[PDB]
Amino acid sequence: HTDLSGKVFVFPRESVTDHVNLITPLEKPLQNFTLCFRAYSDLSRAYSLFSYNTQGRDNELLVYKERVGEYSLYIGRHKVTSKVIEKFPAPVHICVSWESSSGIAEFWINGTPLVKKGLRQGYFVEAQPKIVLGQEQDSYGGKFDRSQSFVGEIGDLYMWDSVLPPENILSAYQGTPLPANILDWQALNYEIRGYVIIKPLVWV
Template sequence: MQVARRGICWRLFLFSCLLLESSCQDFGGQTQFICTSVPKDMDICAATLQNSVPGEDLKTTVMQLRETVLQQKETIMNQKETIRELTSKLARCESQSGAEPGDARPGGRRKDAGTKNTMGDVSRGPADTLTQLSQTLQSLKQRLENLEQFSRSNNSVQANSLKDLLQSKIDDLEKQVLSRVNSIEEGKPGLRNETEQRGRVESTLTSLHQRITDLEKGQRENRPLDKFQLTFPLRTNYMYAKVKKSLPEMYALTVCMWLKSNASPGVGTPFSYAVPGQANELVLIEWGNNPMEILINDKVAKLPFLINDGKWHHICVTWTTRDGVWEAFQDGVKRGSGENLAPYHPIKPQGLLILGQEQDTLGGGFDATQAFVGDLANFHIWDRKLSVGEIYNLATCSSKAQVGNVFAWMETSLDIYGGASKWTFEACRQLN
């Protein structure tokens, strides 16, 4: 009976050792199980009760350990399944983003939205592209009308011939644009060839620009360098003219010019002069529903001009740094005056004078909503205040009229950008 009891105790002891050892291995070997030797003649069960926890407590501990191990295994299996699902979803997302429709570039990346196209503006969607092409066509038409007027006044057979050819090309372009509009509205498969068709249209437009430029060059050869006008047919952020030299430091000034515009709302910015650290050193602007304003060192005076009627008008603004006194003249007549416009602040040198755009930074930061739309001519700047009589002579094309001693209107003094064009201009002919 004692032998049988001893055998049962040995089996129970060994079974407990195996269970505890398995549990310790499942926990990554962070714990150890220690077996204690007992004398040969000692009762194993008694030794177990003496050196370890009571039998019932040992059984309870073993069961708790097994249950903990099973829970840990189940948690690990669930986490592995979750990881597999997330990995599968990530692979599907990568495969879809790597091959977007209409994308032919390696790696599936689309072209940068800020890439410039050949027309000088920012590339956008099909609708914006068509709008831009339509505006360009209108610009070309306007230039052709000017050529037609020139040919009528000079009886030029060559001008008429080129005009007819250009008109035919523009008609073809209009048909292409109309076809593109219909394709977009009807959702035809032809949209897949958008890049190729756009390339053909822009190539044709480039050819037209070159032909018109050649014709304008022939026209320029027959006119004096100061008998010209600048035309800004569209409200863009890329059409402008840059004066080649900076203004000097000035304690007084007079700015005069001829303007023609019917743009709404506001004619835009005929000119802006920026210097390092001050983009609004000297600006003439009319935008939104605001009246025309002159800015000096970012200080503002509202001017009483009404010129957006599509007719030529002569305007002048005078200013002196002492007390910031200013005067405004339209068509030779004084329309308003004031003071305290940037008093005792001289116009700074080493800046950049731009015609047709308002500068937010030195030489850049153009905003299409503030661009000048219309015609500009005979732009002059003096470093003194002109008298009432001198301004009247300028507005009435008197032989006594002077040219600006700071900036005089000459073709060789300007660089033209973005498609703005130059045409023959005679101020006195406009008045007759």
């Protein structure tokens, strides 16, 4: 595993090939999670931010940007979307959490909460995922689509098996995240495929 403190993945061009695989030792289905990261892109078309598929299951956990100001979460193929005022282009800090017991999904953009939405109450997100940055999966680990590819920079990614309270979301946004047990930027197990370059983070 690798300490990526102070660094970003750069996906420097549009492709159907360039991606990073993220490896987690996650064998138990998820009832609760929070995912935070920073991104900087000047794409106006739609793109995937974080794609988690399991065997036989597309869009098992997907964070997707449909257009400026609109963020979508998919859980087990079902989707919710919330809106925010944002400048374009601009760096962003994105957190999203989901809680099975209520179905509530919370997006937080630059430390501000979006309107709560709900989906998949009682569901468990399936384990043994393939997790990809830079492309949107339609199969278990593949079937990418360049019109959904992420071109730009991603850093400071964390995933926890709990729903972070507001104080811990703000801490992540400020740069003092709680250590994370599913994915953690200070100890990330990743595989680069194609043209992805690791560079210093210069925009936070």
